[PDB]
Amino acid sequence: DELYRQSLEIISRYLREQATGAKDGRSGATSRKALETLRRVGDGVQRNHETAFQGMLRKLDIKNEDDVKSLSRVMIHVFSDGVTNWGRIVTLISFGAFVAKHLKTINQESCIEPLAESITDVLVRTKRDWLVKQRGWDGFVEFFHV
Numbered sequence: 001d002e003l004y005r006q007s008l009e010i011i012s013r014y015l016r017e018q019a020t021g022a023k024d025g026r027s028g029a030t031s032r033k034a035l036e037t038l039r040r041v042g043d044g045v046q047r048n049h050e051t052a053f054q055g056m057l058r059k060l061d062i063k064n065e066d067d068v069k070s071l072s073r074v075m076i077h078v079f080s081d082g083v084t085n086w087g088r089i090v091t092l093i094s095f096g097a098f099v100a101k102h103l104k105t106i107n108q109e110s111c112i113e114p115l116a117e118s119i120t121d122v123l124v125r126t127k128r129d130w131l132v133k134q135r136g137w138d139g140f141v142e143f144f145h146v
């Protein structure tokens with residue numbers, strides 16, 4: 001599953017670098033651009049909607065691996081409610097980045113990569129055909145061009 005692998009590489013690297021605060025495959029030229037667009041818009045979403053992120057994180061009260069595992073139910077539910085668009089995908093991944101920052105903070109960084117997997121599973125498995133139509137991460141980068 002190439003679309004899956006690439007999405008996980010992107011989502012994993014963004015989450016990892018955001019938590020660690022230090023930068024780290026196929027279709028890599030696209031992935032570097034996707035990762036570049038993500039740092040830019042993903043960071044914007046996290047700053048401008050920080051109170052909502054803090055509130056959601058707090059309510060979630062993630063303390064361990066079973067709390068991360070529990071995240072997927074809320075994730076699939078609320079992420080699937082609105083109409084499919086890249087802005088919703090950025091909210092999904094961005095909040096993931098937020099959670100990744102929290103995990104590292106509380107010494108649960110080993111849960112980060114699995115978290116990126118939960119996220120990539122929701123994104124790709126529920127929006128697979130839409131992504132295909134949008135030409136994957138090329139559509140992503142295209143949509144946010146500045």
Ligand SMILES: CC(C)CS(=O)(=O)NC(=O)c1ccc2c(c1)N(CC1CCC1)C[C@H](c1ccc(Cl)cc1Cl)O2
Pocket residue numbers: 052053056071074075078079081082088091092093095096099115119
């Ligand atoms: C009222 C408004 C929210 C409605 S809306 O239709 O505009 N909502 C969305 O578009 C949306 C899409 C994906 C989302 C979320 C929301 N949220 C909740 C958000 C984060 C601040 C509150 C986090 C969720 C998520 C992502 C990673 C991990 Cl690890 C866990 C979770 Cl629960 O992903």
